[PDB]
Design a binder for this molecule. Structure first.
Ligand code: MG
Ligand code: ZN
Ligand code: ZN
Ligand code: ZN
Ligand code: ZN
Lengths: 99, 112, 662, 144, 97, 171, 107, 56, 196, 167, 118
């Protein structure tokens, strides 16, 4: 339950930001049946939006990262991605950002 | 902090040309690269050294050497990976095959 | 004909245990012994008994049965042989590993140099995995050059306890090509270490010694690395090709096995009939080289085995590693049946989830639909139609597994279909097929379409799906795969279907969109200037298949009844879709007429461009597919493409040289 | 005599011997031309080296040559080891004779049919009791 | 047609498992081979007409199973057996997950 | 000899029998291929006890066939022979190779190398049988045989018997 | 904790392992000028009890080897003085969940 | 290379993102238990604006 | 015409626009393997030849070579070659003492057809007989044939319209070929416009 | 677990109480607990089969002179059993052709005199199976009775058994 | 063969690039009955996943294909997939799903009680 609240705290923050008392009663101007339908629809969409277990998210992530590399001072792009995935003690443009 | 810097660097590479990728794929990549306490490279001597079974380690590169090092050490392959079931042709434990279906009897007699 | 019934239980492989072969198990599971390097008989027409192509090991001819299992080609798995080597040889893929064991155990009494009386040994034994523990033991025992028969006590270094071991100094062992040599410590004498000495040392190694080294006591002992009984792969591993159905050219493994038999016979004759030690060493080196090049031709610092034609011998490692090996070329990626491939052309009058399949491809590809009471008449009619005219059928599989080809069967009369039989019919309309464009870098390019049979020679598909496929019709080809069961077809239609994949999990924006000139025409349809007359409005409303049937009231009532383009395009958009977007300087009044406002399934203001129907988040496509569903969004794709294509057909669009001059 | 090990493609329904058999190579089946029942499916229609066992017999040997990274001493040792092989001395001498016949015909710029016929004549006319005392040059000239 | 590596990976991404199984079994090579219960090897002499199975090296006629594997996998296992490496195939688990 | 054992069978029920009364169909299919079936693991399974309750688990739908694989656990009486066990029987057939004696479900062969030399075969008499100076062995005659060895296939068990041991033969 | 100035001799290093449960930890002055936890990249670390670790392994139905790992040479690990066999819970900032909780076992 | 490295990872029924051995990569997928296909870009109104704007 | 496709006038195709001749040559030789192991040009027959192909053999002549001008179809044999084998075998069921020869013919491609144009008999350096058969066919431009500009503007035929459907100017000139406008400025191909 | 492989073991022998890797003294029930191996003689197994058949008769219904009992069990077998029932008929014919005990009372008497011997179920089942009358014959028929049981004890057990049979 | 300048990438052919760069428990144990989690502490989602839905339609379509007794009243539908969709729509399908946990334990779920929202 602690991990579940930890997972949904950002969406709960968004829900409280949008469905506040002042914004509903002043800007949004819904009615009681409309508000209940909104609560039911938000609950239904969030329940249908959970990641379906058994989904092979690893190969999907690998494809979703490998595809934008195809479409394209310090080095960037394909050689920098090569230097990232193949971790090397030296790189083309070693840089430091001191604040 | 190494994982955070890795995620920031990969994000910089991805969005250098303006292409955008969702966070969760990047998080999965950097978490796999930092799941062993060190920056495990995606090379032949990186992720292919973990004892995840001989067949997935030999599917990527150096098949014969991995099969030698498995046969000397007598590694027991659990056959839960994707490539093991692909080689053996049986249904992989992914997607529709990530569960099993039985037939019910209480509901079946309950309907009629 | 299928495969004949067996009484064995049908199980799935749950675990795979690797290891090594003991010589006893090789001699036990073998069905024959190889004695002659020749393959053919003296009459050059039958398989030689005791040769490399003994019928007990298997067969590679369709008319020949196996001598052991008494079965044909499709059932025989092939049976292994054994060669009893005169002298033991080292396995080429373990020599350095053997060298590591040569730096771990003693070379005289076959025991570990340092036992548990050392703290470093005790902390090295605490390593759980086999590889790191063996590496630590090898790196820590390589500097120990004495057997250590007597060691100081662990609890206190005041008394000396005599542990196991002979106390002889361990010589430095180094590899020379395919052999191992050792130099003793000068108080240096260098000599070649014989393989049988290493085998005897490995046999002298106790169970706990290689258990600490990580070798399993049941499946992989170190002593089983020393090859003294060579397994012989069956003829299905090493087939004989035919060039014009008369030549009997053998595989490279047959050549290597013949060379191994020749070397073994030469070594046996030299041992029995007497030879100098130079000849014995040369013969055993030749046998070791033949075994090594049979196992791995690519050895650094070693010449390779060459064929008569001058090409290198394609060894086991070369057949296993690389791209076109067994693993990467026959297991991970393999040629499949029930597939097609041809060039592509766009067809804007097809639906989004529909692909146009040629009629010859439909006649060739087959799908087995079983005979049910629900489709007895349709399948009977398809059987009676024959394999010549689409729609038709090509095979009828009865319940015993026997299959009737429908050609060469019409003269025998029609076959009455019973329940449970299969009919391999042609692929008809609304048959889901997976559709592919290589390289297929992402999952949006492996997508399940519905067959529409078209009378030409190209795959035809909707123009919207050319963006996830990364396809343009400049000669590109795509592939089609047909499912072969109800489960497979059902999961293909319910998982990989075109409408289900409009939003891409790559970047949570719709990967498909109204693109190319249908994107251009929709800009010229919904301008402020564009008004459409009655005779064109009626056809633009009729082109929508899910048109609600009521004529929209014109935005220009009189002096002339004229509809605006936004009003006509709003018929393609289903009701209940509301979208709001503002560009720079965009208000509720719109002088530039940028932005976009869609209220109650009607376009209020704003031209439709790449920011509204294109492959971008916050557009019409994303809103419709997340509020109404995938099917409604696919129908939206079809309706908008139909309306915009018809309007640009009757309106026209061009570009020219004068468009590029100021 | 001996094991049969023969497979006959007989249709089990027509019971007509010999049956009319059609080998559909394109669709990869063996079918009965009377009833259309298949007999054997998944039929097999490069990877090795051509060797006709009529020109030189059932000789199966490979030489040793230089690879990508090759030590010369190991190659010399392996060539000397292959030299002192006593079982294939007859095969080695008939291969040397074939090499001399093809060189001597090839310096005569005669077609390949002459070399093939001379080689097969030398092979089928070797190891004969009535032909042992003649010099090898006469044997080669007669074969040519 | 080449149902290559990347096509297989995209099929993994879709979660279609029976499609992958029938591209890897029924569309190319569905080979039925018998294995022993004691040893995991496929060196089982199977006279199916006599309905008799006999495994050399174990001398058992009562503990033989049948499995469906691709012929490429069977060839890989047999050549590995020629490599003095034993890919023993067992039909039951031995260790907890 | 006769034992009472606990066995498990994997039954592939077809989807065609997926009716509301599928338990009766499963039970009938179980007793079709168990009664009289020979198994080298457990001997000849003859009859099934405890019919009022048979432990039927949850049936597994096969991943490519759709048929339900049930693991039915039952209790049954079996006849598993062992070498070194002496059994009575009756001779059902005879030949110059020897005679087949029926014990329970099994045809044990006593070969011509495994009787004492007094017994000789004759085919002139009807039926062709064995006779000695003290006893005869004919069809449907009581005898006692010692099982020297038995071979067990997956679906057939054959045993070799002898009568050379004293205090054997006809009772 | 012993904080030296320049270096440690190997002869003193080999006696750093001492009688348990007493432990010896050595840190350099130059390697400890700046608190690494005050950096933005390092998230919050909390060392868990044995009861909490057992509850974590029981509720997520894991094993000792199925958790993500942290090596016993990381500067945060030396900052918390971690040993083998204990799990630290890591609270970090997430751009899709605000706060995220992970667990790493020190190996 | 990336596909082979991330080949065996799948979200199980406990909403943990694990590989073939059962090793945890993430304790919940994407740190939120969320499919990528149902993600839209949304603005957080509270983080923007001033304190007076927040009070209004 | 989208994604670089082109709309082609079907009437222009019917009048010979880009219609072409396609010549494919097949080479077939004999060789002598020894005394009697040889192969021969003759028309095979069902009575005494093994492993006959299912294609029709009536197109041949007495010497086993098809006369020029004869129409050929899918996988129909154009060169008939036979070779002797060992008699009195037992294989495939249909083996007897009659089948003293087996077929070594070279059939046509399973999709290619056309008209045999020229059959040429000669001898190579070896003096052995070898033949060359040239099959000539038409390649009508249909949907899928790739057409190119002189500026890299390649593309297949999308569809073919007849004249009464395809647009026309006031002078009656119906174009031969309609190309997509969007292919011009993305590629910055101006020389196509200036060439036109 | 167990490193299963074809290890070294003796061959199956009924004289040395080696009945196989599965036919052990302690068997595992479906409930999971261990039980003694249930071995039967000829008469006891004939009873167990007969009440099994009449129990199947009772289950299906709700939804002395040798020849009359033979025709009764024949009609019972032909109405109860389905296909492939020749083997059960032939072995039950074997049982009734070699049965020595008719009712359950004498079978219970045999099992209660044989349970006090403290022997394996193998030997008590064989002693209930073999129609023996001599101690030396029992020694030469069952080799495991050597150095296991007294000769006079065998004599009184066999004479009580020989008293027990009727018809 | 052919000679074409139409550049066609060889696919699954990364080994060229590979050769370019080669140088750089507590709760459940054994097979006891603690694997079968009873209904009162099922920790899985009561919503049927799209993969579970896909295999349920596939398996029911295959059973109806092999002539299983259909539990719903058809309106003349013939395709097995649509009949399976109709059966799951009004919950007359008598199949159950074993949601497998990573540790080997499993939870049973009747599709009658599974909420079908997609
Ligand atoms: Mg292209
Ligand atoms: Zn065989
Ligand atoms: Zn020593
Ligand atoms: Zn027929
Ligand atoms: Zn075995």
């Amino acid at each position: 339950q602690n991990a579940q609240r930890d997972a949904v705290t950002l969406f709960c923050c968004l829900l409280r930001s949008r469905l506040a008392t002042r914004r509903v009663l002043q800007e949004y101007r819904l009615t009681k049946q409309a508000f209940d339908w909104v609560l039911s629809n938000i609950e239904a969409q969030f329940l249908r939006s959970v990641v379906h277990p058994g989904e092979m998210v690893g190969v999907l992530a690998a494809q979703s990262i490998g595809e934008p590399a195809t479409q394209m001072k310090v080095t960037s792009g394909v050689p920098r991605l090569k230097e990232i995935l193949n971790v090397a003690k030296n790189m083309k443009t070693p840089s430091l950002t001191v604040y | 902090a190494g994982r955070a810097a890795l995620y920031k660097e990969v994000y910089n590479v991805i969005a250098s040309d303006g292409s955008y990728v969702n966070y969760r794929h990047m998080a999965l990549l950097v978490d796999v690269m930092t799941t062993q306490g060190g920056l495990t490279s995606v090379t032949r001597h990186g992720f292919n050294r973990s004892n995840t079974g001989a067949l997935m380690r030999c599917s990527f590169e150096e098949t014969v050497e991995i099969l030698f090092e498995a046969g000397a050490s007598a590694e027991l392959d659990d056959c839960r990976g994707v490539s093991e079931n692909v080689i053996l042709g049986q249904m992989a434990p992914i997607g529709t095959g990530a569960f099993d279906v039985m037939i019910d009897e209480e509901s079946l007699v309950k309907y009629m | 004909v299928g495969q004949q019934y067996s009484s064995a239980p049908l199980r799935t492989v749950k675990e795979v245990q690797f290891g090594l072969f003991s010589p006893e198990e090789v001699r036990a599971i073998s069905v024959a012994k190889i004695r002659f390097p020749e393959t053919m008989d003296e009459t050059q027409t039958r398989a030689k008994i005791g040769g490399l192509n003994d019928p007990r090991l298997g067969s590679i001819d369709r008319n020949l049965k196996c001598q052991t299992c008494q079965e044909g080609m499709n059932e025989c798995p092939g049976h292994f042989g054994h060669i009893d080597l005169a002298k033991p040889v080292f396995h080429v893929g373990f020599i350095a590993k053997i060298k590591k064991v040569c730096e771990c155990v003693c070379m005289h009494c076959g025991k570990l140099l340092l036992d548990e009386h050392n703290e470093l040994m005790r902390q090295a034994l605490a390593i759980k995995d086999s590889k790191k523990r063996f590496a630590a033991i090898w790196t820590l025992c390589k500097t120990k050059m004495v057997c250590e028969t007597d060691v100081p006590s662990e609890d206190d270094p005041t008394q000396l306890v005599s542990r196991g071991g002979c106390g002889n100094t361990q010589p430095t062992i180094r590899k020379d090509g395919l052999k191992l040599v050792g130099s003793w410590k000068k108080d240096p004498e260098l000599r070649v270490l014989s393989t049988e000495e290493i085998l005897n040392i490995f046999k002298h190694i106790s169970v706990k010694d290689f258990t600490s080294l990580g070798f399993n006591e049941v499946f992989s002992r170190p002593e089983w690395m020393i090859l003294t009984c060579l397994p012989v792969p069956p003829p299905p591993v090493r087939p004989s090709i035919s060039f014009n159905e008369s030549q009997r050219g053998e595989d490279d493994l047959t050549f290597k096995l013949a060379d191994i038999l020749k070397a073994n016979i030469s070594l046996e004759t030299l041992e029995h009939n007497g030879a100098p030690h130079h000849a014995i060493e040369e013969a055993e080196s030749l046998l070791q080289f033949h075994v090594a090049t049979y196992m791995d031709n690519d050895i650094a610092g070693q010449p390779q085995a060459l064929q008569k034609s001058g090409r290198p011998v394609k060894s086991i490692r070369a057949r296993l590693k690389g791209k076109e090996g067994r693993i990467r070329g026959n297991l991970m990626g393999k040629r499949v049946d029930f597939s097609a491939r041809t060039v592509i052309s766009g067809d804007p009058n097809l639906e989004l989830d529909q692909v146009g399949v040629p009629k010859s491809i439909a006649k060739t590809l087959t799908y087995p639909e079983v005979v049910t009471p629900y489709n007895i008449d349709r399948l009977t009619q398809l059987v009676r139609n024959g394999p010549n005219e689409h729609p038709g059928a090509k095979y009828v599989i009865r319940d015993s597994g026997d299959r009737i080809d429908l050609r060469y069967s019409k003269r025998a009369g029609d076959i009455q279909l019973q329940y449970g039989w299969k009919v391999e019919r042609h692929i008809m309309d609304n048959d889901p097929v997976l559709f592919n464009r290589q390289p297929s870098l992402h999952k949006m390019s492996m997508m399940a379409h519905r067959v529409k049979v078209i009378p030409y020679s190209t795959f035809r598909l909707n123009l919207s799906v050319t963006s996830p496929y990364n396809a343009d019709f400049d000669g590109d080809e795509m592939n089609l795969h047909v499912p072969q069961s109800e489960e497979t077809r059902a999961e293909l239609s319910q998982l990989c279907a075109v409408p289900l994949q409009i939003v891409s999990p790559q970047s949570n924006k719709p990967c498909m969109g109204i693109v190319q000139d249908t994107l251009c025409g929709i800009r010229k349809l919904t301008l402020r200037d564009t008004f459409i007359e009655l005779d064109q409005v009626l056809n633009m409303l009729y082109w929508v298949p899910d048109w609600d049937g009521v004529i929209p009231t014109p935005a220009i009532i009189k002096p002339k009844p004229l509809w605006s383009g936004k009003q006509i395009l709003s018929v393609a958009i289903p009701n209940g879709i509301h979208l709001q977007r503002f560009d720079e300087g965009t208000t509720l009044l719109s002088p530039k007429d940028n932005g976009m406002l869609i209220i109650d399934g009607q376009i209020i203001f704003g031209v439709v461009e790449k920011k509204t129907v294109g492959s971008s988040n916050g557009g019409l496509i994303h809103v419709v597919t997340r509020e109404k569903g995938p099917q409604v969004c696919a129908k939206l794709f079809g309706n908008i493409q139909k309306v915009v294509n018809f309007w640009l057909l009757h309106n026209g669009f061009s570009t020219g040289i004068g468009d590029t001059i100021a | 005599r001996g094991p049969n090990l023969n497979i006959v493609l007989t249709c089990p329904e027509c019971k007509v011997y010999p049956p009319k058999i059609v080998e559909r190579f394109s669709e990869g089946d063996v079918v009965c031309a009377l009833c259309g029942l298949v007999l054997s499916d998944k039929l097999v229609d490069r990877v090795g080296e051509a060797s006709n066992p009529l020109l030189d017999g059932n000789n199966l040997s490979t030489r040793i040559g230089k690879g990508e990274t090759t030590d010369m001493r190991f190659t010399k040792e392996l060539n000397k080891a292959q030299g002192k092989n006593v079982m294939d001395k007859k095969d080695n001498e008939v291969q040397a004779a074939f090499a001399k016949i093809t060189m001597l015909c090839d310096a005569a710029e005669l077609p390949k049919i002459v070399k093939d016929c001379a080689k097969e004549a030398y092979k089928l006319c070797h190891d004969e009791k009535t032909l042992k005392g003649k010099s090898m040059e006469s044997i080669m000239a007669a074969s040519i | 047609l080449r149902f290559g590596e990347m096509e297989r990976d995209c099929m993994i991404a879709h979660g279609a498992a029976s499609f992958l199984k029938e591209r890897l079994m029924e569309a190319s090579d569905a080979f039925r081979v018998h294995i022993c219960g004691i040893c995991g090897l496929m060196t089982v002499i199977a006279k199916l007409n006599h309905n008799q199975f006999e495994c050399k090296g174990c001398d058992n006629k009562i503990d033989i199973y049948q499995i469906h594997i691709p012929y490429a996998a069977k060839l890989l296992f047999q050549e590995l057996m020629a490599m003095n490496i034993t890919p023993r195939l067992y039909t039951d688990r031995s260790r907890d997950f | 000899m006769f034992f009472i054992k606990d066995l498990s069978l994997n039954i592939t029920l077809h989807p065609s029998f997926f009716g509301p009364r599928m338990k009766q169909y499963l039970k009938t299919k179980l007793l079709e291929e168990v009664e009289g079936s020979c198994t080298g693991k457990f001997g000849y399974i003859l009859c099934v006890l405890d019919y009022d309750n048979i432990d039927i688990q949850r049936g597994r739908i096969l991943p490519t066939d759709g048929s339900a694989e049930f693991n039915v656990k039952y209790r049954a009486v079996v006849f598993k022979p062992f070498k070194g066990e002496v059994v009575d029987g009756t001779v059902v057939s005879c030949s110059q190779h020897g005679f087949e004696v029926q014990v329970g479900p099994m045809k044990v062969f006593v070969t011509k190398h495994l009787m004492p030399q007094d017994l000789t075969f004759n085919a002139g008499s009807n039926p062709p049988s064995y006779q000695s100076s003290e006893d005869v062995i004919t069809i449907k005659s009581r005898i006692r045989v010692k099982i020297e060895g038995c071979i067990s296939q997956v679906s057939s068990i054959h045993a070799i018997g002898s009568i050379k041991e004293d205090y054997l033969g006809a009772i | 904790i012993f904080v030296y100035q320049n270096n440690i001799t190997p002869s003193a290093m080999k006696l750093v392992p001492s009688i348990p449960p007493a432990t010896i930890e050595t840190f350099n002055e130059a390697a400890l000028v700046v608190n690494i936890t005050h950096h933005e990249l390092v998230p919050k670390h909390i060392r868990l009890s044995s009861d909490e670790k057992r509850e974590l392994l029981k509720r997520y139905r894991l094993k000792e080897s199925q958790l993500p790992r942290i090596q016993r040479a990381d500067p945060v690990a030396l900052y918390l003085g971690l040993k083998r066999g204990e799990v630290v819970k890591i609270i970090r900032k997430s751009e899709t969940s605000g706060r995220y909780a992970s667990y790493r076992i020190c190996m | 290379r990336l596909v082979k490295a991330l080949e065996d990872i799948m979200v199980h029924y406990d909403n943990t993102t694990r590989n073939s051995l059962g090793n945890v990569i993430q304790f919940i997928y994407g740190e939120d238990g969320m499919d990528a296909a149902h993600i839209e870009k949304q603005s957080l109104d509270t983080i923007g604006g001033s304190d007076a704007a927040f009070e209004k | 015409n989208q994604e670089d496709s082109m709309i082609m006038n079907q009437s222009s195709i019917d009048r010979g626009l880009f219609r072409s001749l396609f010549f494919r040559s097949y080479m077939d030789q004999e060789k002598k393997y020894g005394m009697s192991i040889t192969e021969t040009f003759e028309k095979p027959q069902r009575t005494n030849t093994l492993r006959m192909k299912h294609g029709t053999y009536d197109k041949l002549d007495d010497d086993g070579l098809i006369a020029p001008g004869v129409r050929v179809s899918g996988e129909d044999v154009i060169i008939g070659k036979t070779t002797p084998i060992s008699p009195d075998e037992e294989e495939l069921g249909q083996r007897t003492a009659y089948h003293s020869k087996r077929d070594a013919s070279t059939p046509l491609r399973s999709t290619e057809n056309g008209i045999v144009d020229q059959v040429l008999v000669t001898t190579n350096q070896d003096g052995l007989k070898f033949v060359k058969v040239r099959v000539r066919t038409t390649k009508i431009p249909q949907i899928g044939d790739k057409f190119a500009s002189r500026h890299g503007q390649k593309g297949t035929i999308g569809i073919t319209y007849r004249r009464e459907d395809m647009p026309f100017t006031a002078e009656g000139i119906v174009p031969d070929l309609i190309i997509n406008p969007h292919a011009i400025p993305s590629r910055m191909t101006v020389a196509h416009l200036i060439e036109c | 677990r167990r490193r299963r492989l074809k290890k070294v073991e003796e061959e199956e022998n009924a004289a040395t109480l080696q009945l196989g890797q599965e036919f052990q003294l302690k068997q595992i029930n479906h409930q999971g607990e261990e039980e003694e191996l249930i071995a039967l003689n000829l008469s006891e197994a004939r009873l167990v089969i007969k009440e099994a058949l009449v129990e199947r008769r009772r289950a299906f219904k709700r939804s002395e002179t040798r020849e009359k009992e033979l025709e009764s069990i024949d009609v019972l077998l032909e109405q109860t059993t389905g296909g492939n029932n020749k083997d059960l008929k032939n072995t039950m014919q074997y049982l009734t052709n070699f049965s020595r005990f008719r009712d359950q009372e004498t079978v219970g008497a045999v099992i209660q005199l044989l349970k006090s011997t403290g022997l394996h179920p193998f030997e008590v089942a064989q002693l209930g199976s073999l129609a023996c009358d001599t101690a030396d014959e029992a020694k030469t028929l069952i080799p495991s009775l050597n150095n296991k049981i007294s000769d006079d004890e065998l004599e009184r057990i066999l004479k009580e058994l020989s008293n027990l049979e009727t018809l | 063969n052919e000679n074409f300048e139409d550049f066609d990438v060889e696919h699954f052919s990364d080994e060229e690039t590979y050769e370019e760069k080669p140088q750089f428990e507590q709760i459940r144990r054994k097979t006891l009955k603690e694997k079968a989690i009873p209904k009162d502490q099922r920790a899985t989602t009561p919503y049927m996943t799209k993969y579970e839905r896909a295999r349920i339609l596939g398996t029911r379509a295959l059973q109806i294909s092999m002539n299983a007794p259909v539990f719903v009243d058809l309106e003349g539908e013939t395709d097995p997939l649509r009949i399976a969709m109709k059966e799951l729509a009004e919950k007359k399908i008598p199949l159950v799903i074993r949601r497998y946990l990573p540790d080997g334990s499993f939870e049973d779920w009747s599709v009658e009680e599974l909420i079908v929202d997609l």
